[PDB]
């Protein structure tokens, strides 16, 4: 991954994501989310990421 | 018969009532400082606290 001055931006669209497996992983040092609860992330349907 | 606009009082009363009601019903869509104008999405997107 590049440096902070060269942050890498990527587009995610046209896919069926699954955030449950990502959340249940314990390798994350910190996981805090604003505006959306992590538990309900599997029900909302967005436009792009 | 021929000359209209001779019944101004009743029309004014009806117009005032209808306009007040329309303003009240249109006020329902205001954000009022929150993140959404509908409570259903607030329940379907956030966590109680």
Swiss-Prot record, chain A:
Effect upon mutating residue 30 to A: In strain: Omicron/BA.2, Omicron/BA.2.12.1, Omicron/BA.4, Omicron/BA.5, Omicron/BQ.1.1, Omicron/XBB.1.5, Omicron/EG.5.1
Mutagenesis / variant outcome for changing residue 25 to L: In strain: Omicron/BA.1
Biological role stated in the UniProt entry: Attaches the virion to the cell membrane by interacting with host receptor, initiating the infection. The major receptor is host ACE2. When S2/S2' has been cleaved, binding to the receptor triggers direct fusion at the cell membrane. When S2/S2' has not been cleaved, binding to the receptor results in internalization of the virus by endocytosis using host TFRC and GRM2 and leading to fusion of the virion membrane with the host endosomal membrane. Alternatively, may use NRP1/NRP2 and integrin as entry receptors.
Quaternary data: Binds to host ACE2. RBD also interacts with the N-linked glycan on 'Asn-90' of ACE2. Cleavage of S generates a polybasic C-terminal sequence on S1 that binds to host Neuropilin-1 (NRP1) and Neuropilin-2 (NRP2) receptors. Interacts with host integrin alpha-5/beta-1 (ITGA5:ITGB1) and with ACE2 in complex with integrin alpha-5/beta-1 (ITGA5:ITGB1). May interact via cytoplasmic c-terminus with M protein. May interact (via N-terminus) with host bilirubin and biliverdin, thereby preventing antibody binding to the SARS-CoV-2 spike NTD via an allosteric mechanism.
Protein name: Spike protein S1
Upper lineage: Viruses, Riboviria, Orthornavirae, Pisuviricota, Pisoniviricetes
Gene: S
Covered residues, full protein: 347 to 395 of 1273
């Amino acid at each position: 991954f590049a440096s902070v001055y060269a942050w890498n931006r990527k587009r995610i669209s046209n896919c069926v994501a699954d955030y449950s497996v990502l959340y249940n992983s314990a390798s994350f040092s910190t996981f805090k989310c604003y505006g959306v609860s992590p538990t309900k992330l599997n029900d909302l349907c967005f436009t792009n990421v | 018969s021929s000359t209209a606009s001779a019944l101004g009082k009743l029309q004014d009363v009806v117009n005032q009532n209808a306009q007040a009601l329309n303003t009240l019903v249109k006020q329902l869509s205001s954000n009022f400082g929150a993140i959404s104008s509908v409570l259903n999405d607030i329940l379907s997107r956030l966590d109680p606290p």
